[PDB]
Structures are given as structure tokens and as C-alpha cells.
């Protein structure tokens, strides 16, 4: 499911992050040796992590978002969220037509426009696989006309089988909340829920 | 009209004149940007410029109105060199101390008018102000 | 349309249901305000640049009285509402606060044409008077609650402050032993209260108005100035050294402030003319301060 | 909130006028007011455009009253440009300070009315103000 | 302990009829919260007249017609009919004021509300007072 | 600096003559107007970028973000 | 805005050749910001001229000898030799500046881009105007 | 965008030898940082001369020694002979400033660096101008 926002819900302005924190958590074998040389080894798989926090709400918007994150409890079933910072449309075009040849696995991708899509990705946007729902971020770009080599963070998850279409824009977390256990909402003599803050956390 | 949307048009003497409009509807409650360019289809635009304020005023041009796009939303108000140098010639001769380059000619306005079919008269005043002559020398 | 001067105006103070209107007013201050929750809700989303701003409250008011002496001393009513209890015409200052809330009362600012407006949950702060060489005048310092605008009003006709009490010059004693060049001799009392903002949750889409206040403290003090003056060569009587206890009174013909027992601290000024400032403040164990109100012949 | 009802239209000369008046009912007992619009049934709307209030006073012009999309709320006050010509002919010939082209043509208000919708004749004023001609340029 | 409002001041609207409604509600401030009962209006009446001025041998402008609504709800009408407040306009000052020429002033009213009957008690009660102002319409 | 930009061209004209202000609700006058102040402001703040690599030398504030802009009014 | 973004001064140094560089570029702002593409001035004439004053009788004091240096890529060169620039240092106001005394009024210019094309579009522009000023100098 | 500094004053010494030497390098603002290259001065050739007033008809005071002294790294020097200094020194301003008598006032001084040749242009270039100071000495 979407997490509401403003872009979602524009009649509830309060919504919205006041600020963002996307952490990166990549485990690892650390280990120090006595000669000086640190070596690590990469094992669990990496994570994106969001940690939002939400300005002054008011009673009906807090009621829609408490209302939302309430049937995401019952449902069970994921919250996708859309960080505002990584959209910016730096690439139009429709990206059905753009194939990802087959057999790919690690950072590197290559993936052929067949002259379809118009602007340049730039190192530190988002990506995202149409099949898998892991979202990278890419790290250097180099195109050779139509064809484009792009360099993602995290490995690729899955090997690619020449039908997953690349994602530039609208990418969501599928993420799962992490302060549900214990989450309390103070409404003020003022007349707004003040601190309401959440704790996402990739999930797969 | 829009009393509080004036705007003075300068024309640049020696030079044909051509200014632009664009008719495009918004509704922006279902979320920001979102504007639809409107169909100008069977409009026709039309005005004029006088020397003064009021009635018996000497008519000093009429603008060669067009549209440019149909369904685009793209019209044009405009007039070719001659007539602005008939401005120019007509124009006041009381220059500013500190723009010295601007004379004030006349007023002037136009309307919009809707000949539809199954219609009727739809005038309507878009544009309202006076027309300042900016001087030229390098004819 | 109808403008509101100062000059016609008319304060009557509203107590037990009696109507006291407070003539020979020399001027009084006054102010109304509301207050606001003004928050920006600047988003990743959205850098707005519109406040979401709420009237939620009303300002407790700070209204100022200037009132001259009269000769049928309704003005020590502003003693006896701020808390010294009363025998005849003299008030005490009370070993301990009697309650815990103050005395509350409500205002009125009459005006033309049934113009008014009304402060209500008043209660008297401060009262401090200037015994000098001009005519005595005490500043009274009321705070308000809730401020409102009313049609009719009550209008106190009959008790009135009467003719202003003619000058007569201070004079400081001890025990009956003046003290010399008196230059101004200046009391201050206060009821230092508290207002208990009581806004909750139940008040949200509401104005909320300061309803109920506790007393602090409740003091007596005075600050007298002196011309440093000495009769002998290592005086014991006129000096700088402190005085833990001795009994006070600044007199006049028409008041009295006693202190039974008083702690005088001095202050020397090396102006042009030497100056000593005395800061007397009652003792510990001292007996309740006095405040005399003599209308004619004592 | 309190009262609005005065507010000044401002007409435009050669040119046919038209306004359109979307009727609404805001309550504020909840936070978002709440926007539900009033019905328009068994509702008739009047309007003179009388110069100065005081009695006898010649009556310059009339409006039109149109009621459509009862549904929504929405009417329409109008009046054709013989009606604009008839109100131009008899405005004073002194100008607006704010804006040299207005002058004062009248006055005016639009009172709706429920006619034995429970027999009853709840006539009420909605608006009113001055009626300001802005002289044209095209004509 | 409280002030009451008595002197209202009614702003009426030429060419339409006027009407005003109050309702009358008992009240008390007891242990259990505020209790408030609608005022039983039977055998009480009301009326108002209209005058120029204060002054003894004021000229009488009009009078308002007076009706009870729902006297189980406590509510009484007090309002006067368009030709009313033609009368009223054509007797009101002259005196036009800037910023706004609409509003003239028309006199002072009077509202008495009385129960009269052989077991009770000739008691009358003037629930308001104040001044009539008058809205100039051109309409009509 | 030694040599400049001097606007012969862009230059401000007469001043407007005086005209007395009036404040209006829709088209309604509010009387008795005494003072009407406005105030617009851009509430920037600089961004201190002063850094080890800058010692020894004359450092100057060079970048600023907005932290708010506001349209305010006292009558 | 109106008049004042098309408006820059020149001042023409004397006893040295005056030539200005103008690179046309077509910026894009509104849709997105920093895109900027250069102008094909192909067909695309440029002509300009000096006068003393801005009345109907004016001394044609110089005029630009302007040129298209490079077709595309959207640069052009408007440029006045040394004798022209003699005349412009005669021909000038005797009253010198008092924040730069090196330099005198000399007159008035405008600059005009003709696109003159076989497509029936042959617009004018004034893409430049202002006043020009004449720098003394002593190295002859 | 920001400005540039072409007025500079000078200020000679009597008696003694004035020697200054200018550099061109060639400058530009990319994704790379600052790139400079030393400007080649090849056909690159000065001339400078002195006056006691800007307006025409000046006498010339004296002028300026040019040279060339690196073409590699862009560096060329403009100076004068002790003989050219005395001469400036005798035509000098006897008009005298308090807080430091040493300094009168010489005349205006401009410098063009110009290049000739059949393919290049007629183009030259006012690099710099201002003011010529004298610090009169006592020793020869």
C-alpha cells in the first residue's frame, strides 16, 4: 500500500516529511587484523533504512495517517513510501520499450533504450527493477548512445532474464514500520498531535 | 473587465510590433500544475487605440489581430511597422526627465468574441492600458 | 461615527455588587490582546510559505489606575481587596495570606453613547505612592482574565471619591525622633499572584480566558532618600551601619505607614549633594505593618 | 467572516456583462468547513440599478436573473449591452481615484426570495454596493 | 453577578420585512452543572413601538406586530411587515453618514414582555431597548 | 575596486506624488485609518563553509539557503 | 521589466578599435531550469546605428559594422572601426563624468536583428539599446 | 561577472629606474577547475604615453619603453629609463600635498597592447590607464 503524502492527498498539506533520514545498512564481517589490514566480508543482505518525521498535525489529518498506518497492521501487507528529493524527472519517456539483456548479476547493468528515453541519469538518483522491489542507487553512468552502462550500490539482487524494465521515476520502498510495538500519538491544548515520527526499514 | 490586471504595452519604434496571449484554463484542487490549453476555435479577438479617455477621441490604430493556433490556445495581438510609426507620429511629445525613450500614445483594449453556432453574443475585455512608444534611431 | 476619548471616560470597579466608581482619576493605561499558535509547516514535500495560525486565547490585561487621596477614602479599598484585613479606618498587613486565591472583582471603562468595555477576574497586584514634595498620587496595578465588550453596565453614583486632600509634607520618626532632610519617601505593597493556566485539550477550537490565580506572596516596603547628613564626630545615631530592628513611621497629615519593627539598609550617593537611601522592609517577628487613612482632623 | 455584502461591480463599456454567482453554504463546526452547496429550488433573484438611495430616484437599469445548475447552487446575474449602453449613458462624468477609467453609475443589490416554498415569503437582500462603468477604447 | 445586555441596537433592510426572534430559557448554576429549561410562554405578550426621539411627545414611527412561535420551546417572534418598514424609511433622518450612505437612523424602540390575567400579578418587563437603523435599498 | 558599473540607462524616474492610503474589506472602507505598515521578508541565513583548508587566509560567507519567506501587515 | 532587461551601456574606448562579442543562446527556464541551446542565426541580419539625440533631427554620428561571425552556434560581432571611433570621441559632450572623468556622453543606439527568410516569417527585434559613452584617452 | 581593475595608478621614484611587468594568462571556469595557460605573446606589442591632462591638446610628458620578455610565459614588461623619470620629474605639478611632500602629481598614462601582421586584425586594446605619481628624491 502508499503511505499518504502530499502528493497522494494534497487536502491534508501537514503530511509530508519535515525531515528525512535514509540510512544506509549494509552488514559485515569486520575484522581488524594485528598487521594493520581491516578485511570485510559482505554476507546479509543491505538494507535502505527511512526514518521520517512528521511536522504539527492536525486532528483530521493525523486521523487520516493513524487510519492508513492502522489498516497497514491489519492487512499486513507492505507500505510503500516516495522519497520527494530523489523526484526529480531527470528522465522522460515511456521505458517499456527499453530492454535489459539477460544474464546480469553484480553492481554493473546495461540496458538499451532503442532510442526511446530523453535525459541523462546522474550518479546519487534512484533505480528500481520492475520485477524486484530492492531499489539501488546509482553510483556513475556511462552511456555510448543508445546503450547506457549504469553502476548501482547494491548489487543487483536477482540476475536479470531480459524482460525486467528499468523504473527512473516514481520508485517506492516497499519498507515495514519499525516503532509499531509501541506507537503513541500526544495531542497538545493547542490543538495538534506534535513529534509524530516513524521509524521505516526496507524489507527485502 | 480586469480593472486590476492593467498593463502598458511599449511598442519599439522602426520595429513591427507582436505580442502573444495564451488562453489556458487551470484547476489545480486535484493537484498542482494542472492546466488545460483552451480551444479557441471560431474566436475572434479584436480592439482598437484612441488618443483619450473618453468619447470623440481621435482613433489612432487598430491592432491586425489573429489566431495563431486554433485548439492551442495561442493568440497574437499585433500591428505591422506602418502603423507604428503612425503611433509614433501621433504620440505626445511630453518626454520624462529620467525616460527620455517612452512617450505615451493613447489607450487601448480588445475583445474576445465567441460566432458559434447555437450561441450568442460572448464579448468579453481581456486586455485594458495605455501604449507607450519607446524611440528608435537607427531607423 | 462615535470616537472613544479618554478625557469622557468613567472606571467603575465592580465588587459585591456595588458599583465604586473611582473619581479624581488622573490618568489610566490599558491594553487588550489575544494570543495566537502560529506554526510553519515547512515540508520536504512543500516549502510553504503560509502560517497556520489559531486565536486560542486571551492575554491576561494589565490595566494601570492613577488615583488621587479623597477625603471619603474609597481608595483604601485597594488595600483592603488586595488582602489587609481591616480595624476602623487602618489597615494590617497580615502575619500570614489569608486564602490561597485572591480577591477577584470586575471593571468597567464606561464610555459615550453605552460604550464599554468590561475586564471581569481582576485583582489588585500592586499599590505604590510617592510621599515628596508634589501631591501624593498611588499607581494601582490591576490584572484581568477576560476582557469583553458590553452594552449596559453598571455606573456607581453614588459611591464616589470625594474632594482631593490637600498637600502636607512627609516626615519619617523613630519612636517620635525625626529624621532629618527627608528628601522622598516612597511605599510599595504588592499581591504578587500567579495565573494557573488551566488550557486543555476540552478548549481546542475555543478562546480561552484565565479564570482562577493563587497568591505568591504579600509584602509591605518602602524606599526612603535621605541628604546624608551628620550632627556630631563619629555619630551613633546617623550612620551607614545596618539596622536589624528598629520601629518606623513615614507620617503625614492624612497617612500613616508604621512599621513596628523595620530592617533599614543605606545606601551612600556621592552626588552633588550627599545622599543616603534607606530600603526598609519589615523584620521577621514584627508586628503587622500599618497603613493609617486619615480623612480630615485625623 | 461577519457580513460581505457590499461589494463593488465594475462594468465594462461595449461589452455585454454576465456574473456568475456560485451559491455556498460553509459550516465551520468541524475543522474542514464543510462545503455543501445550497439548493436552488422555488428561489427568484431581483436587481435594480438605481442612481443615489434616495427616494424617486430613476431607475438606470435592471438586472436579468438567470437560474441554472440548481443542483450545484450555482445562478447567473446578467444584463445585455444595451442594457451596458443605457447604464454608460447616465454615469456621472467624474472618475473613479483609484482607476481613471471607472465612474460612478449607481447603485445596487440582488435580493433572493422563496416563494410559498412553506408559505412563506423569505425575501432576503444578498448583496449590494456601487455599479461602476469602465469606459472603453474598442467602440 | 455577571452584566446583562439590554440595549440592542437593529439594523433593518428597506423593501424587506424584518424579523427577530427570542427565546426565553430559564437557567442555574447548582452542584449538578447548567440546567436550562425552556420558559413556559402562556398569557405572556409582548409589544414595541417605535419613536424619533427619547423626548416626551416623541413623533411614533411605527409599532412591531408581536407572535409566539413555540412556547413548549420558549420562542417569541417580535418582527413588523414590509410596509413597516417602508413607514420606517420614509420617517428616518435624512442624515446620510461616509463609508457607508446605506444606514440612517430611524429611533428608538422598546420591547415589554407582560403576563396579564385576574390571578396574576400586573408585572411588566422591558427585556430590551435601543435604537432602529435602516439599510436604504434601491430594489423595489 | 578601481573600476565600476554605473547604470546610465536603469535609473529610477520622478517620485510618485503623495496619495493618501485606505484599507478595504472586499469593497467595503474601513474608517479612521491612522498608519499602514507592510512588511515583506526573505529570512535567509548563511552558510558557514569555514574549514581547515581555509587557515591562513581571509575566509567570506559565499552560499545561503531560504529558511522562509512571509507577507505580514500591521494596521 | 517592461524595457529594462533588453538595456546595457557601451563604452568605446578612444583611439582603439570598439568590438563587441554577442553569443545568442536559447534558455529554457520555465520548464525546467538550466537548459540552454544556442540559436541558429542563419538568415538572422543584424544592422545598428548612433545618434546624438532622440528627436526627430539627429546626427547619424556612426553606425554598426555588425557581422555574423559564426552561422550557427548563435554568435555574432558588432564592431565600429577606429575611425568611427575618432569621430564618436569628436562628436561627443565636453561634460565629463564625476565618478569616472575619463568618460562623456556621445549618443544614443539601438540594435535591430532582421531574420529575413524565404519562410514568409521576416520579424524585427530591438535586442539592444541604451546610451554610449565615450573613454578619453592619451596614448593616441 | 565580477569586475575588472583597468585603472591603476603609478607612482615613480626620482632618480631611479621604473620597471613593471604584466602577465596575460589565459583563464576559464569548467567541471575541471581553474585551467591557466600563459598567454603567447607572439606579433603582441605595447606602447605608452604620458600626459599632464586628458583634455586634447595635452603636452606629451614623456613615454614609456616597451619590451617583451617571455613569450612562453606570457610575461611583458613596460617600463622607463632614470633620463625618462628625470624629465617626467621636471614636468610635474609644483603643487605640493602636506603629510607626505614627496608625492606631486605627473599626468594620465594608457597602455595598448596591439597586434599587427597581413592575417591578423586591426585590433587593439586599452589594457590599462590612470594616473602617473612622482616621489620626488634628493640624492643625484
Redesign the interface.
Known amino acids: 500500500m502508499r503511505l499518504p503524502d502530499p502528493y497522494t492527498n494534497p487536502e491534508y498539506p501537514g503530511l509530508g516529511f519535515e525531515s528525512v533520514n535514509l540510512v544506509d545498512n549494509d552488514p559485515m564481517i569486520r575484522d581488524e587484523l594485528p598487521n594493520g589490514k581491516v578485511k570485510e566480508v559482505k554476507i546479509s543482505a543491505q538494507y535502505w533504512g527511512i526514518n521520517i518525521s512528521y511536522p504539527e498535525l492536525f486532528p483530521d489529518e493525523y486521523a487520516f495517517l493513524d487510519s492508513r498506518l492502522l489498516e497497514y497492521k491489519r492487512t499486513g501487507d507492505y507500505l510503500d513510501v516516495l522519497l520527494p528529493q530523489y523526484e526529480a524527472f531527470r528522465v522522460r519517456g515511456d521505458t517499456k520499450s527499453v530492454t535489459i539483456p539477460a544474464g546480469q548479476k553484480g553492481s554493473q547493468i546495461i540496458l538499451n533504450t532503442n532510442g526511446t528515453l530523453t535525459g541523462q541519469p546522474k550518479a546519487g538518483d534512484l533505480f528500481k527493477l520492475s520485477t524486484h522491489p530492492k531499489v539501488y542507487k546509482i553510483t556513475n553512468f556511462s552511456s555510448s548512445g543508445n546503450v547506457w552502462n549504469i553502476s548501482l550500490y547494491p548489487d543487483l539482487f536477482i540476475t536479470t532474464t531480459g524482460s525486467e524494465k528499468p523504473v527512473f521515476n516514481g520508485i517506492l520502498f516497499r519498507t515495514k514500520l519499525m516503532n509499531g510495538d509501541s506507537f503513541g500519538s500526544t495531542l497538545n491544548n493547542n490543538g495538534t498531535y506534535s513529534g509524530i515520527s516513524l521509524s521505516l526499514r526496507e524489507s527485502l | 473587465s480586469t480593472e486590476n490586471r492593467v498593463i502598458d504595452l511599449v511598442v519599439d519604434e522602426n520595429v513591427p510590433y507582436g505580442l502573444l496571449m495564451q488562453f489556458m484554463d487551470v484547476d489545480d484542487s486535484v493537484y498542482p500544475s494542472t492546466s488545460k490549453p483552451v480551444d479557441l476555435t471560431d474566436f475572434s479577438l479584436r480592439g482598437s487605440i484612441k488618443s483619450s479617455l473618453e468619447d470623440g477621441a481621435e482613433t489612432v490604430a487598430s491592432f491586425t489581430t489573429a489566431i495563431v493556433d486554433a485548439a492551442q490556445g495561442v493568440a497574437s495581438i499585433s500591428l505591422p511597422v506602418s502603423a507604428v510609426t503612425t503611433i509614433a507620429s501621433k504620440a505626445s511629445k511630453e518626454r520624462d526627465r529620467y525616460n527620455p525613450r517612452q512617450r505615451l500614445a493613447g489607450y487601448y483594449d480588445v475583445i474576445i468574441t465567441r460566432t458559434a453556432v447555437g450561441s450568442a453574443a460572448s464579448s468579453f475585455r481581456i486586455m485594458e492600458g495605455k501604449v507607450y512608444i519607446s524611440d528608435g534611431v537607427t531607423q | ?1 462615535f ?1 472613544s476619548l479618554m478625557r469622557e471616560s468613567k472606571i467603575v470597579i465592580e465588587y459585591d ?1 456595588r458599583g465604586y466608581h473611582f473619581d479624581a482619576l488622573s490618568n489610566y493605561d490599558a491594553s487588550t490582546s489575544f494570543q495566537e ?1 502560529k ?11 503560509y ?2 495560525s ?1 486565536i ?1 486565547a486571551q492575554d491576561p490585561s494589565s490595566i494601570s489606575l492613577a488615583i488621587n487621596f479623597s477625603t471619603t477614602l474609597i481608595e483604601s479599598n485597594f488595600f483592603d481587596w488586595m488582602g489587609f484585613t481591616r480595624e476602623g479606618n487602618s489597615l494590617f498587613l497580615p502575619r500570614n495570606t489569608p486564602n490561597i486565591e485572591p480577591i477577584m472583582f ?1 471593571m468597567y471603562i464606561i464610555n459615550h453613547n ?1 460604550s464599554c468595555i ?1 475586564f ?1 477576574n481582576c485583582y489588585v497586584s500592586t499599590v505604590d505612592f510617592s510621599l515628596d514634595k508634589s501631591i501624593p498620587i498611588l499607581n494601582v496595578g490591576i490584572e484581568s482574565g477576560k476582557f469583553s465588550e ?5 455606573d456607581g453614583y453614588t459611591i464616589t471619591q470625594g474632594e482631593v486632600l490637600p498637600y502636607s509634607a512627609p516626615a519619617v520618626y523613630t519612636n517620635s525622633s525625626p529624621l532629618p532632610a527627608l528628601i522622598s519617601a516612597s511605599m510599595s505593597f504588592q499581591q504578587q499572584c500567579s495565573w494557573r493556566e488551566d ?3 476540552f ?3 475555543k478562546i480561552y480566558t484565565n479564570k482562577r490565580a493563587y497568591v505568591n506572596e504579600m509584602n509591605a516596603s518602602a524606599t526612603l532618600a535621605f541628604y546624608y547628613v551628620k550632627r556630631l564626630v563619629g555619630d551613633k545615631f546617623l550612620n551607614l551601619d545596618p539596622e536589624t530592628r528598629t520601629p518606623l513611621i513615614i507620617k503625614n497629615k492624612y497617612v500613616s505607614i508604621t512599621f513596628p519593627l523595620a530592617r533599614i539598609s543605606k545606601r551612600l550617593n556621592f552626588s552633588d549633594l550627599y545622599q543616603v537611601e534607606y530600603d526598609v522592609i519589615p523584620t521577621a517577628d514584627s508586628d503587622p505593618v500599618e497603613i493609617n487613612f486619615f480623612g480630615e482632623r485625623k
Request: charged letters at 25%.
Open positions: 461615527m470616537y455588587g499558535f506554526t510553519l509547516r515547512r515540508t520536504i514535500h512543500n516549502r510553504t510559505n502560517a497556520d489559531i486560542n470586575n453605552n468590561y471581569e458590553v452594552s449596559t453596565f453598571r488550557r486543555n485539550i478548549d481546542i477550537n
